[PDB]
Amino acid sequence: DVDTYLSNLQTKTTLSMIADGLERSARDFDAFLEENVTLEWEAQRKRIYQHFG
Amino acid sequence: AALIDSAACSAVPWLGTSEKILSRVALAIAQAALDVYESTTTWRFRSELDRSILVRDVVGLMHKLVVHAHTLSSHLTSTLSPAAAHIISSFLTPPPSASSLRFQPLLGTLLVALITPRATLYPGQSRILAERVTSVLAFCTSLLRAADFLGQTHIPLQTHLFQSACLLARLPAANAVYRAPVLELLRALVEVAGRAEPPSLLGYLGSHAARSFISLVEGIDKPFGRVEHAVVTWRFFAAVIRNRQQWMAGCLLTGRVGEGSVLAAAMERLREVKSLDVQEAVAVMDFVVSAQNYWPWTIFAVRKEKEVVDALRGYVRGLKAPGMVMKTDGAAAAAFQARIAAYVAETFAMQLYHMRQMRQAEKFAGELVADLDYFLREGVMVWGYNASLHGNFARNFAKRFPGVEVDDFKRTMWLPRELGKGYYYALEVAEQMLGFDAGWGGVKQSGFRKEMETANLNLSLVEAQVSLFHAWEYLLLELTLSLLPKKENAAFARQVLQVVEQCLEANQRSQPPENIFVVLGHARAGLALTLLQRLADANQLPRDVTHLLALVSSAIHAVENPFGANDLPYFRTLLKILFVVLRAAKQGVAITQQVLTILDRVVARCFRALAALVHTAPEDLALITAILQACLSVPGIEQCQVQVLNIMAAHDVFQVAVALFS
Amino acid sequence: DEDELKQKLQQIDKTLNDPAQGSRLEELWSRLIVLRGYAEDLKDQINQ
Amino acid sequence: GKDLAKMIKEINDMSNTLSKGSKPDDPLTQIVRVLNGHLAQLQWIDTNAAALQAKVAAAQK
Amino acid sequence: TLTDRTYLPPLEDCLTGRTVILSWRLVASALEDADLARLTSPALSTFLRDGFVHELLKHPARVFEPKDLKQEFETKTSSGVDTIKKDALWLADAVAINQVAALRIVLIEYQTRAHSHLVLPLSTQDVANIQEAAGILSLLNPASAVDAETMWCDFETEARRRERILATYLSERRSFTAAVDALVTFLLHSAPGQHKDLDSLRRALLKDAFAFDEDLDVPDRSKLLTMAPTYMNLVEDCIARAQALPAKLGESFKTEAFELDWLRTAITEAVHSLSIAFQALDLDTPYFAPHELLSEWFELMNSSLFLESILGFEVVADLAMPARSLVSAICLKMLNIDRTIQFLHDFDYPDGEEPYLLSSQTLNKIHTAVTNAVNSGVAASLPVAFAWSLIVHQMHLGYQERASPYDDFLREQRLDNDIAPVEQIAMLATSRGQVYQVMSEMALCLGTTHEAAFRPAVGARARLVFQDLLKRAAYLIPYQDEPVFSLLAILATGRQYWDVTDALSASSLNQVYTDMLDDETLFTQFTMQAINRFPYEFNPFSVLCRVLAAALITNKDKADVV
């Protein structure tokens, strides 16, 4: 385990890698909003399908 | 030197003087002192003590001149500004022909010190030489800091300071007194080598000499165990590790794992923080973080191999760390405890990130989440700024000192700000600058000194709170991903909701100043944003928006409506926060009356402002559209459609929408 | 011809026995260990 | 040379483990490595061929 | 129930580094710099508060007296230890010290190898870097400079290791002497307004070692007054080792450098012993010291020629001058010219202690010692000889008015009828103002200025004997410029203008100054005459006003005298 950990290690500050979580969140939020608005359009269409009958 | 010291007190006896006269006299004095310093390398004294005293005096004068110029940034330090400026221009970027004439005196002093024999007699000469060495070291440090400041990319003095450190590595061997000053100098040289690979220090020191110096310094004041020399050696180690030094860092961490390395003793000190002085604990934790962020594979490995002694002590510290410690016995220890907790949280977050990368962070995180009580108490809440006493002190100082203001004592960032009573206000200088007239001393240790000390302690506490904020933000951000499964959901959701509520309440309550600390706008909004994001991804919310949205609405109402102003990130993050909040509400009636305010006053106003400005805009308009779409989906709206028809028709949004569509 | 030999030897020996050249490696090693720790941490974080 | 070799090895270890560390017996790092080999050999070919090409200009007197 | 646990911690701690033994170097440094943090540190606090360290510092001879502690050595060395044990055994076989002390010194040297290596000559690359920096300043030695490889390979050798061990042994001896001296100084002449922790530590150390309690109206000086012979007897072994190196030591190590180092160490140890004795003596200024000890001390000085045999070399002048000054100071102290004249003129018994005045043998010994010293042609004996001559000049007249034990002396060496020898000695001493010049030099080396060889309090308490000598000698020899310049160089010492501070110190340190305004002899003869000779004789009055204004800044009772 330690062998692979040292093999795949990069010379750089650790506090910068964890920071990437912010970027990843900012890039996931977009897709999450797109899923919100798609499940919303879906819901709306559904309620219309239950309005017409 | 006495003339310069007297001129330093520019806050006052002085009939027959003026700023220009004092400035010219100081410039002439600086020129004369520099000429003497350049000429002393040629005279032949009957003995070495005379030249030593002369060098000590001139170095002390130059140091007092340099520090006085950068210690403050107000007009109080303008009388000696042409002089300090001259000395700096002549000791940082001298001509190449007379560059060595200004450096040979220091080299000769270091040589004479490193080859003076040890003697039990003649204590006068010994103390004079010690003071001379300390003055030379302080002057070197001041020059290094001055070069680091003002944006100096090419420092020709560094080439000579390296070969001077070549001697300073052995100089402490003659006298232990030099161990702290020397290390300080080295720390400042390393700092100048960071913001400027650098010249390999091992090439100047040497393998054997470097190993001997490491074996001498690794033990932090073991025979006595003082706090000053300890914080000094811990800051030195942190600075040496933070820079690109790799050979020295490896020899200091490994010790040639670690059996006699600095870390072997740092763990021995960490396992007794419950009784150790909080002042030294901060420096020890800073060293730990500096060794982890740059050399994690060693520090984290050793800590996991010995976690049975560190995790227990961390849990003990966390459980018995009250939040409001001001009211209890102790006022200055609050900032120290907050800084210690912030460093502990940062280290926990880093080791949890490493374990997650190694896929061994489940049990450790599950055991640590039960220790976040101190965080829930004094974490994201930064309302401990107590602007009341700060404003009172400012008014009392402006009423008694019309000319000098309270903000004039702000540090110029020349030296790393201490997390003590001198974080923002320069007390070391104020003690000698305002102590000439009655009012500073005060009866029964009262007056302006105690109030300034309390204000500095409060600012240090706020800084420690911000550090803990960042640490806990990272920790919780990684834990939200770690604790994805369906367990410990109750306490987890409770903690997240409490954090969000504390953030939203602090966003409304009194804000801190923007000139002292960093603007909080957009700094603590994304935290709650991502928290609610991940909690919605997990779908484990108690649909308790009935009260959570009130704070967001109050913030959106009392934000001055900077829809398109410079505060665009703040507006966007607030919009995303309210979006996720109203989405969580949709998943859940008394909700419609509480959510119609955003549909009536917020969405319409922002849409009209955007339509009027557009005559940046695309993403904001898309976010507003998504907000309205997700807000029109709440179940409470399918019945209040009648009630909302009029509010939606009053602004005639359809006209502007069709216009922009054209 | 000894002079030439010790001249070459002195040149290469002088080139090797330099503070900077010797220091670069030491600096590099730590400079690597930084990335080692950073990568290992960021790896453990994204070890899912 | 030995220490430098150790360094390079460790760098390889860190890069390889960082990029992938849940299957060190996989075919990706395989393709990477073999493909690197090919790159190096191709470089050798290119350079030496260029050298020989240069050597011909001398005969063009 | 006095073990060496805190004194000599287990070898496992010394080797693993979990507890660095508090060597005498660190204690001496902390006591010399008067650092608050170090002196109040837990480690040093527990080390000094232990009764074992108290018994050791009260009996330094036992610290190096040859004993058979083979059992203790084996028990300590059992439960890199083989080399440590071998070095300890070799050192114990070479020097007469016990095996425990040798083992402790070897452990301290092992812990201090970094310093011993860093204080060595630099390598070739360092010399090259220094030359590059230089572009006067020629304090290097490139002719002998070598690379680091050959410097380290030679450092780990056996001969070099043994030489370093011996050097560390000598350094630790000097450090122990300086540390005990500074400790006695701080415990006897503690400055006021110090931190509460320092006062508490002082009171604890006193009550534990000497039972000296400040809340008692009469503290127990017995255990503090018994520290004079404890070191006057050790000075014998010091001079014996100075005049003869260890025989069991290998001849290969007995080189010029080693001989010079041994001589310097012996001189430093003798100076520290003399200083400790002078301190323990001035602790009780008015009362006399036991004549049984002064007899042996004067016999010792007679035999050794006032340490002129070991100090006769020209390479120990820097250490000889202060050594001679301190010898003269302690001689004048034990002589008590002031109290001696008071007793000879008052005839009332002091009751503090019996003086040598009632023993004719001691008087004969002192007289023959002074005669031998003056015949040998040495300057260090100038003030002591002059003083003794004055005493004899007062005894002669005391006999003329009575024409009792001193009569035996006066008639034993044929000193009753003729007064030629003492008169000739005084004439030679006063010729060319040699006595005054040597006294001024001693005061300079025993003052408070940065040129002084000892601490400020040491010189402040050492100038008292010279001031008393000038007091009793002023009414004998008339007023003249030479004695005045001598007293000026004594009281002022030649310090600078910025050497004046308002730092409040113990009254004892201010005694040497206030005496000028306390005793009528030093008031109506020097101060009054100096004021009357103004501005004609400007330097005396000026320097007197300067020193008075510099010394009476905090003394509110005499702040408006200048």
For E492-559, give the DSSP string: HTT--GGG-------HHHHHHHHHHHHSSHHIIIIIHHHHHS-STTHHHHHHHHHHHHHHSSS-GGGS
Q: Which two tokens stand for residue B619?
A: 């993403």
Give the distance, in angstroms, between the CA of residue A21 and the centroid of all CA atoms in the same chain: 10
Q: What is the DSSP string of B293-332?
A: HHSHHHHHHHHHHTHHHHHHHHHHHHHT--S--SSSS-SS
Tell whether A50 lies on the interface with C, counting CB pairs under 8 A. Answer: no
Q: Write the DSSP string, E105-158.
A: HHHHHHHTHHHHHHTSPP-HHHHHHHHHHT-------TTT---HHHHHHHHTSH
User: Which residues have a Cβ under 8 Å from the Cβ of B13 and sit 6 or more positions away?
Assistant: none
What single-letter amino acid sits at B19? E
Q: Are E100 and E69 in contact (CB under 8 A)?
A: yes
DSSP state of B602: I
Contact B411, B77 (CB under 8 A): no
Instruction: Please state, in angstroms and rounded to a whole number, the distance separating the CA atoms of residues E52 and E5.
Output: 9
Residues 6+ apart with CB under 8 A from E37: B224, B226, B227, B228
Q: Which residue type occupies E496?
A: Q
Query: Where does B539-586 show beta strands of DSSP type E?
Result: none
Asked if E60 and E180 touch (Cβ cutoff 8 Å), the reply is: yes
Contact across the interface for D21 and A3, Cβ inside 8 Å:
no
The identity of residue B242, as a single letter, is R
How far apart are the CA of D29 and the nearest CA of chain C, in angstroms?
A: 17
Partner residue facing E453 (CB), from B122, B164, B212: B122
What type of residue sits at position B265? A
Enumerate the β-bridge partners of residue B358.
C44
Buried b (16+ CB within 10 A) or exposed e, C11-36: eeeeeebebbebbbbbbbbbbbbbbb
Q: Do D11 and C32 touch (CB under 8 A)?
A: yes
Please tell me whether residue B410 adopts helix, strand or coil conformation: strand
What residues of chain C, 1 to 48, have a C-beta less than 8 Å from chain A? 31-43, 45
Across the interface, do E452 and B112 touch by the CB < 8 Å criterion? Answer: no
Phi/psi at B358 (5° precision) = -95, 0
In sequence order, which residues have a C-beta less than 8 Å from that of residue E263 and are 6 or more positions away?
A: E242, E310, E313, E316
Cβ distance of A6 and D10 shorter than 8 Å: yes
CA distance C43 to chain D (A): 6
> Which structure tokens are listed for B250?
């490896």
Listed by the residue before each break, gaps in chain B with C–N over 2.5 Å are 12, 196, 256, 588, 615
Distance CA B106, CA B52 (A): 11
Q: How many CA atoms lie within 13 A of B304 on its CB side?
A: 17
* C-alpha to C-alpha distance for E108 and E101, rounded to whole angstroms: 10
Does the beta carbon of A4 lie under 8 angstroms from any beta carbon of chain C?
Answer: no
Alpha helices in B9-47 (DSSP H): 19-39
Resolution of this structure in Å: 23.0
Are the C-beta atoms of B571 and B556 separated by less than 8 Å? no
B297 contacts A6? CB cut-off 8 A: yes
Q: HEC string of B221-244?
A: CCCCCCCHHHHHHHHHHHHHHHCC
Number of residues in chain C: 48
Helix count (H) and strand count (E) of chain C?
2, 0
Which residue does chain B place closest to C28, by CA atoms? Answer: B246
- Contact list in C for residue B480 (CB cut-off 8 A) is none
Owner of token pair 């100043």: B513
E145 chain-C contacts, CB cut-off 8 A: none
Q: Give φ, ψ of B290 to 5 degrees.
A: -65, -35
The count of residues in chain E is 562
What is the rounded distance in angstroms from the CA atom of residue B111 to the CA atom of residue E523? 50
Of residues C29, C39, C47, nearest to D14 (C-beta): C39
Return the H-helix or E-strand segment holding C9: helix C2-16
Scanning every residue of chain C, which has its alpha carbon at the shortest distance from the alpha carbon of E125?
Answer: C17
Contact C26 B202 (CB under 8 A): yes
3-class secondary structure, B358: strand
Question: In this structure, are residues B456 and B390 in contact, taking their beta carbons and an 8 Å threshold?
Answer: no
Reference B145, options B37, B8, B137, B102; nearest CA is B137
Q: Chain C contact for A16, CB < 8 A?
A: yes
B56–chain E nearest CA distance, Å: 14
DSSP C46: T
Instruction: Please give the residue of chain C at the shortest CA–CA distance from B250.
Output: C30
Query: Chain A closest CA to B487's CA: distance in Å?
Result: 23
Question: Pick from C30, E117, E138: which is nearest to B169 by CA?
Answer: E117
> Which residues in chain A have their CB less than 8 angstroms from residue D24's CB?
4
Kindly determine whether residue B633 and residue A43, on different chains, have CB atoms separated by under 8 Å: yes
Cα separation, B337 vs B351, in Å, equals 21
Q: Which H or E run includes E36?
A: helix E36-39
* CA E385 – CA E374 distance, rounded (Å): 7
Say if residues E11 and E76 touch (Cβ distance below 8 Å). yes
Count Cβ–Cβ pairs < 8 Å, chain A vs chain C.
49
Quick one: tokens of B21?
């006269």
Measured CA angle at E284 (ends E436, E232), to 5 deg: 75
Instruction: List chain A residues with CB under 8 Å of D17.
Output: 3-9
> Which has the closest alpha carbon to B333: B418, B404, B420?
B420
Q: Do C32 and D18 touch (CB under 8 A)?
A: no
Residues 8-37 of D with CB under 8 A from C: 10-11, 14, 17-18, 21-22
Distance separating alpha carbons of residues B94 and B74, to the nearest angstrom:
27
Distance from CA of D7 to the nearest CA of C (A): 7
Contacts of E125 in chain C (CB under 8 A): 17, 19
Which of C13, C16, C17 has the highest number of chain E CBs within 10 A, making it the mutation to test binding with E?
C17
Q: Is B107 in Cβ contact with E134 (below 8 Å)?
A: yes
From the list B479, B575, B595, the residue with the least C-alpha distance to B529 is B575
Query: Distance between CA B314 and CA B297 in Å, rounded?
Result: 21
Amino acid symbol at B317? R
CA angle E24, E25, E27 (to 5 degrees): 65
Considering CB atoms only, which of D7, D17, D18 is closest to C29? Answer: D7
Task: Judge contact between E217 and E281, C-beta under 8 A.
Answer: no
Coil, strand or helix: which one is B406? coil
- The two tokens of residue B226 are 């003082």
* Beta-carbon-side half-sphere exposure of residue B10 (alpha carbons within 13 Å): 22
Instruction: Count contacts between B and C (CB, < 8 Å).
Output: 134
Picking from E325, E298, E170, the residue whose alpha carbon sits closest to that of residue E232 is: E298
> How far is A10 from chain B, CA to nearest CA, in Å?
10
End-to-end CA distance of chain D: 43
> Residue A11: its chain D contacts at CB < 8 A?
14
CA distance C14 to chain B (A): 12
Q: How far apart are CA A11 and CA C13, in angstroms?
A: 31
For residue B482, what are the contacts with CB-CB under 8 A and spacing of at least 6? B352, B356, B361, B362, B365
Residues listed for chain D: 61
Q: Determine whether the interchain pair B474/A25 forms a contact, defined as Cβ–Cβ distance below 8 Å.
A: no
Q: C-chain residues within 8 Å CB-CB of A11?
A: 31-36, 38-39
On whether the CB atoms of residues E114 and E133 are closer than 8 A, the answer is no
In angstroms, the CA B528 to CA B577 distance is 7
Instruction: For residue E383, give the amino acid letter.
Output: P
Q: Decide: B40 and B54 in contact? Cβ < 8 Å.
A: yes
Q: Does B398 touch chain E (CB under 8 A)?
A: no
Cβ–Cβ contacts within 10 Å for residue E132, how many? 12
CA A30 to chain C, closest CA, distance in angstroms equals 21
Collapsing DSSP states into helix, strand and coil, what is residue B34?
Answer: helix
What's the token pair of residue D54?
């240069």
How long, in residues, is chain B?
A: 662
Distances (CA, A) of E283 to E185, E221, E290, E292, E323: 10, 9, 14, 19, 21
Partners of C17 on chain E (C-beta within 8 Å) are 125
Tell me the DSSP string of B162-213: HHHHHHHTTGGGT-GGGHHHHHHHHHHHHHHHH------HHHHH-HHHHHHH
Judged by CB atoms closer than 8 Å, whether chains meet at D3 and C28 is answered as no
In chain E, which residue's Cα lies nearest the Cα of C18?
E125
Breaks (C-N over 2.5 A) in chain E follow: 79, 135, 403
Task: Mention every residue, 6+ apart, whose C-beta is less than 8 A from residue A34.
Answer: none
Q: Which residues of E touch B128 (CB under 8 A)?
A: 450
The pair phi, psi for residue B465, each rounded to 5°, is -65, -40
State whether B122 and E174 contact (CB < 8 Å).
Answer: no
Chains A, B: CB contacts within 8 A come to 59
Q: What is the C-alpha radius of gyration for chain E, rounded to an integer number of angstroms?
A: 26
Residue B425: DSSP 8-state: B
* Number of neighbours of residue E148 by Cβ within 10 angstroms: 17
Out of D3, D4, D18, the one facing C43 most closely (by C-beta) is: D18
Buried b (16+ CB within 10 A) or exposed e, A2-20: eebbbbbbbbbbbbebbee
Is-cis flag, bond preceding E535, omega within 30? yes
Which subunits count as partners of chain B given 3+ CB pairs below 8 Å? A, C, E
Is C25–D14 a contact, with Cβ atoms under 8 angstroms apart?
no
Q: Which chain E residue has its CA at the smallest distance from B203's CA?
A: E125
- B399 touching E, CB under 8 A? no
Q: Give yes or no for B592 touching C (CB within 8 A).
A: no
